[PDB]
């Protein structure tokens, strides 16, 4: 089982300038619930985007994909290919744009948070993968964040 988990603006943007272009701390508990106790896989840039105090993400085996055969990530497993990354029975891919696109064909679950923020795509942004008709989904109810942003959860699956 490979699952993907991300948060996106309605437009599809998930990343800009090396970070996430909104604040949504309400997202954190759901991300932990899905991922805790499991192997998580991320691209090298996503690892770089984690603050030092939070990386590796605790309670999860952190696996970092990089083409640098020598790359350095304390508390994480650096691998050079997605096949090497994917060895655990249940794996959650936690980004970024490159790695979601790489892992999508392997995935049978996505847990998506949609952020109701007006954020037109710009060139060079990180973007969420598009889910086609092979996926079936349930849409959750909108909630307001302490930031003022509405957000909602989708759970998608395909067998
Ligand atoms: N909104 C989001 O949900 C996310 C945004 N981000 C954002 O995406 C952006 C990073 O995505 P990118 O597409 O630029 O990069 P990555 O996919 O993380 O890494 C690409 C790197 O992986 C590596 N890579 C890519 N393809 C391969 C490959 N085929 N083989 C080996 N390595 C590969 C390469 O590494 P090296 O340069 O060290 O060689 C490549 O440069 C940042 O803005 C980041 O803040 C990342 C994860 C999530 C995320 O943090 C997250 C997930 C769930 N809930 C809340 C947040």
PDB file of C-alpha atoms and ligand atoms in Angstrom:
ATOM      1  CA  UNK A   1       0.000   0.000   0.000  1.00  0.00           C
ATOM      2  CA  UNK A   2       1.368   3.334  -1.098  1.00  0.00           C
ATOM      3  CA  UNK A   3      -0.649   6.389  -0.043  1.00  0.00           C
ATOM      4  CA  UNK A   4      -0.029  10.039  -0.940  1.00  0.00           C
ATOM      5  CA  UNK A   5      -0.918  12.857   1.516  1.00  0.00           C
ATOM      6  CA  UNK A   6      -0.852  16.545   0.694  1.00  0.00           C
ATOM      7  CA  UNK A   7      -2.575  19.924   1.139  1.00  0.00           C
ATOM      8  CA  UNK A   8      -3.350  22.073  -1.863  1.00  0.00           C
ATOM      9  CA  UNK A   9      -4.890  25.407  -2.753  1.00  0.00           C
ATOM     10  CA  UNK A  10      -7.988  24.901  -4.969  1.00  0.00           C
ATOM     11  CA  UNK A  11      -5.718  25.855  -7.886  1.00  0.00           C
ATOM     12  CA  UNK A  12      -3.438  22.874  -7.313  1.00  0.00           C
ATOM     13  CA  UNK A  13      -0.464  24.819  -5.874  1.00  0.00           C
ATOM     14  CA  UNK A  14       1.205  22.971  -2.958  1.00  0.00           C
ATOM     15  CA  UNK A  15       4.548  24.765  -2.922  1.00  0.00           C
ATOM     16  CA  UNK A  16       6.210  28.103  -3.810  1.00  0.00           C
ATOM     17  CA  UNK A  17       9.675  29.581  -3.110  1.00  0.00           C
ATOM     18  CA  UNK A  18      10.672  26.437  -1.206  1.00  0.00           C
ATOM     19  CA  UNK A  19       7.812  26.518   1.353  1.00  0.00           C
ATOM     20  CA  UNK A  20       4.032  26.174   1.587  1.00  0.00           C
ATOM     21  CA  UNK A  21       2.203  29.443   0.639  1.00  0.00           C
ATOM     22  CA  UNK A  22      -0.327  29.431   3.547  1.00  0.00           C
ATOM     23  CA  UNK A  23      -0.619  28.526   7.196  1.00  0.00           C
ATOM     24  CA  UNK A  24      -2.933  25.735   8.312  1.00  0.00           C
ATOM     25  CA  UNK A  25      -1.841  24.288  11.685  1.00  0.00           C
ATOM     26  CA  UNK A  26      -5.176  22.518  11.938  1.00  0.00           C
ATOM     27  CA  UNK A  27      -3.791  20.209   9.211  1.00  0.00           C
ATOM     28  CA  UNK A  28      -1.066  18.848  11.541  1.00  0.00           C
ATOM     29  CA  UNK A  29      -3.183  16.445  13.640  1.00  0.00           C
ATOM     30  CA  UNK A  30      -4.711  14.796  10.581  1.00  0.00           C
ATOM     31  CA  UNK A  31      -1.258  14.446   8.937  1.00  0.00           C
ATOM     32  CA  UNK A  32       0.074  12.788  12.177  1.00  0.00           C
ATOM     33  CA  UNK A  33      -2.944  10.447  12.413  1.00  0.00           C
ATOM     34  CA  UNK A  34      -2.460   9.193   8.880  1.00  0.00           C
ATOM     35  CA  UNK A  35       1.330   8.908   9.019  1.00  0.00           C
ATOM     36  CA  UNK A  36       2.283   7.974  12.600  1.00  0.00           C
ATOM     37  CA  UNK A  37       4.036   4.614  13.021  1.00  0.00           C
ATOM     38  CA  UNK A  38       4.597   4.222   9.231  1.00  0.00           C
ATOM     39  CA  UNK A  39       7.324   4.689   6.735  1.00  0.00           C
ATOM     40  CA  UNK A  40       7.172   8.101   5.072  1.00  0.00           C
ATOM     41  CA  UNK A  41       8.862   8.977   1.776  1.00  0.00           C
ATOM     42  CA  UNK A  42       9.718  12.497   0.597  1.00  0.00           C
ATOM     43  CA  UNK A  43      11.886  14.227  -2.075  1.00  0.00           C
ATOM     44  CA  UNK A  44      15.120  15.877  -0.971  1.00  0.00           C
ATOM     45  CA  UNK A  45      13.609  19.355  -1.294  1.00  0.00           C
ATOM     46  CA  UNK A  46      10.727  18.460   1.059  1.00  0.00           C
ATOM     47  CA  UNK A  47      13.277  17.202   3.675  1.00  0.00           C
ATOM     48  CA  UNK A  48      15.093  20.581   3.266  1.00  0.00           C
ATOM     49  CA  UNK A  49      11.724  22.322   3.846  1.00  0.00           C
ATOM     50  CA  UNK A  50      11.348  20.685   7.305  1.00  0.00           C
ATOM     51  CA  UNK A  51      12.682  22.820  10.200  1.00  0.00           C
ATOM     52  CA  UNK A  52      15.679  21.252  12.055  1.00  0.00           C
ATOM     53  CA  UNK A  53      13.644  20.794  15.243  1.00  0.00           C
ATOM     54  CA  UNK A  54      11.021  18.692  13.462  1.00  0.00           C
ATOM     55  CA  UNK A  55      13.260  16.540  11.248  1.00  0.00           C
ATOM     56  CA  UNK A  56      13.292  13.568  11.065  1.00  0.00           C
ATOM     57  CA  UNK A  57       9.563  13.481  11.767  1.00  0.00           C
ATOM     58  CA  UNK A  58       9.279  11.495  14.997  1.00  0.00           C
ATOM     59  CA  UNK A  59       7.488   8.176  15.319  1.00  0.00           C
ATOM     60  CA  UNK A  60       7.925   7.561  11.533  1.00  0.00           C
ATOM     61  CA  UNK A  61      10.688   6.020   9.485  1.00  0.00           C
ATOM     62  CA  UNK A  62      11.877   8.952   7.299  1.00  0.00           C
ATOM     63  CA  UNK A  63      13.034   7.966   3.800  1.00  0.00           C
ATOM     64  CA  UNK A  64      14.514  10.742   1.546  1.00  0.00           C
ATOM     65  CA  UNK A  65      14.857  10.353  -2.247  1.00  0.00           C
ATOM     66  CA  UNK A  66      17.933  11.989  -3.754  1.00  0.00           C
ATOM     67  CA  UNK A  67      20.150  11.497  -6.831  1.00  0.00           C
ATOM     68  CA  UNK A  68      23.082  12.684  -4.737  1.00  0.00           C
ATOM     69  CA  UNK A  69      24.618   9.253  -3.862  1.00  0.00           C
ATOM     70  CA  UNK A  70      26.416  10.993  -0.944  1.00  0.00           C
ATOM     71  CA  UNK A  71      23.525  13.176   0.401  1.00  0.00           C
ATOM     72  CA  UNK A  72      23.323  13.852   4.152  1.00  0.00           C
ATOM     73  CA  UNK A  73      20.158  13.625   6.258  1.00  0.00           C
ATOM     74  CA  UNK A  74      20.541  12.909   9.969  1.00  0.00           C
ATOM     75  CA  UNK A  75      17.886  10.411  11.159  1.00  0.00           C
ATOM     76  CA  UNK A  76      16.673   9.673   7.680  1.00  0.00           C
ATOM     77  CA  UNK A  77      17.280   6.934   5.147  1.00  0.00           C
ATOM     78  CA  UNK A  78      18.637   8.474   1.864  1.00  0.00           C
ATOM     79  CA  UNK A  79      17.752   6.381  -1.168  1.00  0.00           C
ATOM     80  CA  UNK A  80      18.508   6.875  -4.868  1.00  0.00           C
ATOM     81  CA  UNK A  81      15.372   5.427  -6.403  1.00  0.00           C
ATOM     82  CA  UNK A  82      11.626   5.093  -5.672  1.00  0.00           C
ATOM     83  CA  UNK A  83      11.862   1.302  -5.749  1.00  0.00           C
ATOM     84  CA  UNK A  84      14.356   1.436  -2.832  1.00  0.00           C
ATOM     85  CA  UNK A  85      12.038   3.865  -1.006  1.00  0.00           C
ATOM     86  CA  UNK A  86       8.960   1.678  -1.351  1.00  0.00           C
ATOM     87  CA  UNK A  87       9.975  -1.497   0.530  1.00  0.00           C
ATOM     88  CA  UNK A  88       7.651  -1.199   3.568  1.00  0.00           C
ATOM     89  CA  UNK A  89       4.096  -2.718   3.439  1.00  0.00           C
ATOM     90  CA  UNK A  90       2.351   0.631   4.159  1.00  0.00           C
ATOM     91  CA  UNK A  91       4.153   3.779   2.965  1.00  0.00           C
ATOM     92  CA  UNK A  92       2.999   7.406   2.954  1.00  0.00           C
ATOM     93  CA  UNK A  93       4.512   9.725   0.405  1.00  0.00           C
ATOM     94  CA  UNK A  94       4.501  13.257   1.894  1.00  0.00           C
ATOM     95  CA  UNK A  95       5.834  15.221  -1.132  1.00  0.00           C
ATOM     96  CA  UNK A  96       6.865  17.263  -2.876  1.00  0.00           C
ATOM     97  CA  UNK A  97       5.613  17.951  -6.444  1.00  0.00           C
ATOM     98  CA  UNK A  98       8.231  15.710  -8.105  1.00  0.00           C
ATOM     99  CA  UNK A  99       7.855  12.833  -5.745  1.00  0.00           C
ATOM    100  CA  UNK A 100       4.016  12.851  -5.779  1.00  0.00           C
ATOM    101  CA  UNK A 101       4.139  12.629  -9.607  1.00  0.00           C
ATOM    102  CA  UNK A 102       6.750   9.781  -9.388  1.00  0.00           C
ATOM    103  CA  UNK A 103       4.727   7.786  -6.837  1.00  0.00           C
ATOM    104  CA  UNK A 104       1.135   8.389  -8.099  1.00  0.00           C
ATOM    105  CA  UNK A 105       1.016   5.162 -10.375  1.00  0.00           C
ATOM    106  CA  UNK A 106       2.044   3.132  -7.219  1.00  0.00           C
ATOM    107  CA  UNK A 107      -0.601   4.683  -4.980  1.00  0.00           C
ATOM    108  CA  UNK A 108      -3.971   3.323  -4.001  1.00  0.00           C
ATOM    109  CA  UNK A 109      -4.925   6.047  -1.425  1.00  0.00           C
ATOM    110  CA  UNK A 110      -4.679   9.823  -1.313  1.00  0.00           C
ATOM    111  CA  UNK A 111      -5.615  11.982   1.681  1.00  0.00           C
ATOM    112  CA  UNK A 112      -5.986  15.509   0.379  1.00  0.00           C
ATOM    113  CA  UNK A 113      -6.588  18.725   2.234  1.00  0.00           C
ATOM    114  CA  UNK A 114      -8.061  21.442   0.023  1.00  0.00           C
ATOM    115  CA  UNK A 115      -7.290  25.035   1.155  1.00  0.00           C
ATOM    116  CA  UNK A 116      -9.879  27.610   0.008  1.00  0.00           C
ATOM    117  CA  UNK A 117      -7.198  30.310  -0.784  1.00  0.00           C
ATOM    118  CA  UNK A 118      -7.007  32.284  -4.084  1.00  0.00           C
ATOM    119  CA  UNK A 119      -3.560  31.360  -5.281  1.00  0.00           C
ATOM    120  CA  UNK A 120      -3.313  31.216  -9.114  1.00  0.00           C
ATOM    121  CA  UNK A 121      -0.567  28.878 -10.358  1.00  0.00           C
ATOM    122  CA  UNK A 122       2.685  30.644 -11.156  1.00  0.00           C
ATOM    123  CA  UNK A 123       5.621  29.326 -13.175  1.00  0.00           C
ATOM    124  CA  UNK A 124       7.948  27.071 -11.219  1.00  0.00           C
ATOM    125  CA  UNK A 125       5.392  26.312  -8.412  1.00  0.00           C
ATOM    126  CA  UNK A 126       5.174  22.817  -6.895  1.00  0.00           C
ATOM    127  CA  UNK A 127       1.780  21.327  -7.946  1.00  0.00           C
ATOM    128  CA  UNK A 128      -0.398  18.531  -6.650  1.00  0.00           C
ATOM    129  CA  UNK A 129      -0.951  15.496  -8.890  1.00  0.00           C
ATOM    130  CA  UNK A 130      -4.327  15.440 -10.688  1.00  0.00           C
ATOM    131  CA  UNK A 131      -6.605  12.522  -9.720  1.00  0.00           C
ATOM    132  CA  UNK A 132      -8.392  10.989 -12.725  1.00  0.00           C
ATOM    133  CA  UNK A 133     -11.480   8.751 -12.955  1.00  0.00           C
ATOM    134  CA  UNK A 134      -9.648   5.662 -11.645  1.00  0.00           C
ATOM    135  CA  UNK A 135     -10.039   7.271  -8.173  1.00  0.00           C
ATOM    136  CA  UNK A 136     -13.089   7.362  -5.997  1.00  0.00           C
ATOM    137  CA  UNK A 137     -13.401   9.930  -3.275  1.00  0.00           C
ATOM    138  CA  UNK A 138     -15.417  11.152  -0.310  1.00  0.00           C
ATOM    139  CA  UNK A 139     -15.473  14.903   0.342  1.00  0.00           C
ATOM    140  CA  UNK A 140     -15.579  16.224   3.930  1.00  0.00           C
ATOM    141  CA  UNK A 141     -17.349  19.392   5.139  1.00  0.00           C
ATOM    142  CA  UNK A 142     -15.601  22.743   5.075  1.00  0.00           C
ATOM    143  CA  UNK A 143     -14.082  23.962   8.421  1.00  0.00           C
ATOM    144  CA  UNK A 144     -12.628  27.471   9.155  1.00  0.00           C
ATOM    145  CA  UNK A 145      -9.039  27.586  10.302  1.00  0.00           C
ATOM    146  CA  UNK A 146      -7.870  29.968  12.995  1.00  0.00           C
ATOM    147  CA  UNK A 147      -6.076  31.722  10.063  1.00  0.00           C
ATOM    148  CA  UNK A 148      -9.475  32.473   8.468  1.00  0.00           C
ATOM    149  CA  UNK A 149      -9.022  29.923   5.588  1.00  0.00           C
ATOM    150  CA  UNK A 150     -11.740  27.362   4.931  1.00  0.00           C
ATOM    151  CA  UNK A 151     -10.372  23.864   4.351  1.00  0.00           C
ATOM    152  CA  UNK A 152     -11.800  20.378   3.784  1.00  0.00           C
ATOM    153  CA  UNK A 153     -10.536  16.782   3.604  1.00  0.00           C
ATOM    154  CA  UNK A 154     -10.886  14.290   0.745  1.00  0.00           C
ATOM    155  CA  UNK A 155     -10.119  10.595   1.083  1.00  0.00           C
ATOM    156  CA  UNK A 156      -9.612   8.918  -2.280  1.00  0.00           C
ATOM    157  CA  UNK A 157      -8.998   5.300  -3.037  1.00  0.00           C
ATOM    158  CA  UNK A 158      -8.609   2.920  -5.967  1.00  0.00           C
ATOM    159  CA  UNK A 159      -8.153  -0.879  -5.741  1.00  0.00           C
TER     160      UNK A 159
HETATM  161  N1  LIG B   1       1.521  21.328   0.420  1.00  0.00           N
HETATM  162  C1  LIG B   1       2.046  20.143   0.720  1.00  0.00           C
HETATM  163  O1  LIG B   1       1.293  19.251   1.106  1.00  0.00           O
HETATM  164  C2  LIG B   1       3.415  19.909   0.641  1.00  0.00           C
HETATM  165  C3  LIG B   1       4.227  20.869   0.048  1.00  0.00           C
HETATM  166  N2  LIG B   1       5.546  20.754  -0.084  1.00  0.00           N
HETATM  167  C4  LIG B   1       6.247  21.689  -0.976  1.00  0.00           C
HETATM  168  O2  LIG B   1       6.641  21.204  -2.267  1.00  0.00           O
HETATM  169  C5  LIG B   1       7.862  21.865  -2.632  1.00  0.00           C
HETATM  170  C6  LIG B   1       8.970  20.844  -2.828  1.00  0.00           C
HETATM  171  O3  LIG B   1       8.561  20.032  -3.933  1.00  0.00           O
HETATM  172  P1  LIG B   1       9.487  19.775  -5.224  1.00  0.00           P
HETATM  173  O4  LIG B   1       8.787  19.105  -6.341  1.00  0.00           O
HETATM  174  O5  LIG B   1      10.356  21.077  -5.598  1.00  0.00           O
HETATM  175  O6  LIG B   1      10.690  18.861  -4.665  1.00  0.00           O
HETATM  176  P2  LIG B   1      10.579  17.408  -3.982  1.00  0.00           P
HETATM  177  O7  LIG B   1       9.703  16.434  -4.670  1.00  0.00           O
HETATM  178  O8  LIG B   1      10.322  17.521  -2.397  1.00  0.00           O
HETATM  179  O9  LIG B   1      12.090  16.863  -4.092  1.00  0.00           O
HETATM  180  C7  LIG B   1      12.672  16.768  -5.395  1.00  0.00           C
HETATM  181  C8  LIG B   1      14.068  16.204  -5.187  1.00  0.00           C
HETATM  182  O10 LIG B   1      13.849  14.806  -4.946  1.00  0.00           O
HETATM  183  C9  LIG B   1      14.813  14.045  -5.688  1.00  0.00           C
HETATM  184  N3  LIG B   1      14.231  13.274  -6.809  1.00  0.00           N
HETATM  185  C10 LIG B   1      13.259  13.624  -7.647  1.00  0.00           C
HETATM  186  N4  LIG B   1      13.110  12.595  -8.476  1.00  0.00           N
HETATM  187  C11 LIG B   1      13.974  11.633  -8.165  1.00  0.00           C
HETATM  188  C12 LIG B   1      14.221  10.433  -8.685  1.00  0.00           C
HETATM  189  N5  LIG B   1      13.506  10.005  -9.721  1.00  0.00           N
HETATM  190  N6  LIG B   1      15.142   9.620  -8.148  1.00  0.00           N
HETATM  191  C13 LIG B   1      15.889  10.028  -7.036  1.00  0.00           C
HETATM  192  N7  LIG B   1      15.615  11.306  -6.533  1.00  0.00           N
HETATM  193  C14 LIG B   1      14.662  12.052  -7.108  1.00  0.00           C
HETATM  194  C15 LIG B   1      15.841  15.062  -6.158  1.00  0.00           C
HETATM  195  O11 LIG B   1      16.776  15.327  -5.102  1.00  0.00           O
HETATM  196  P3  LIG B   1      18.300  15.759  -5.395  1.00  0.00           P
HETATM  197  O12 LIG B   1      18.208  17.246  -6.003  1.00  0.00           O
HETATM  198  O13 LIG B   1      18.954  15.935  -3.935  1.00  0.00           O
HETATM  199  O14 LIG B   1      18.950  14.842  -6.358  1.00  0.00           O
HETATM  200  C16 LIG B   1      14.920  16.236  -6.446  1.00  0.00           C
HETATM  201  O15 LIG B   1      15.598  17.501  -6.426  1.00  0.00           O
HETATM  202  C17 LIG B   1       8.247  22.854  -1.543  1.00  0.00           C
HETATM  203  O16 LIG B   1       7.689  24.155  -1.775  1.00  0.00           O
HETATM  204  C18 LIG B   1       7.536  22.211  -0.362  1.00  0.00           C
HETATM  205  O17 LIG B   1       7.269  23.196   0.645  1.00  0.00           O
HETATM  206  C19 LIG B   1       6.057  19.546   0.135  1.00  0.00           C
HETATM  207  C20 LIG B   1       5.301  18.560   0.758  1.00  0.00           C
HETATM  208  C21 LIG B   1       3.980  18.745   1.149  1.00  0.00           C
HETATM  209  C22 LIG B   1       3.947  18.823   2.537  1.00  0.00           C
HETATM  210  O18 LIG B   1       4.759  19.452   3.213  1.00  0.00           O
HETATM  211  C23 LIG B   1       2.811  18.394   3.213  1.00  0.00           C
HETATM  212  C24 LIG B   1       2.195  17.158   3.057  1.00  0.00           C
HETATM  213  C25 LIG B   1       1.037  16.905   3.783  1.00  0.00           C
HETATM  214  N8  LIG B   1       0.447  17.843   4.639  1.00  0.00           N
HETATM  215  C26 LIG B   1       1.067  19.089   4.783  1.00  0.00           C
HETATM  216  C27 LIG B   1       2.242  19.324   4.077  1.00  0.00           C
END
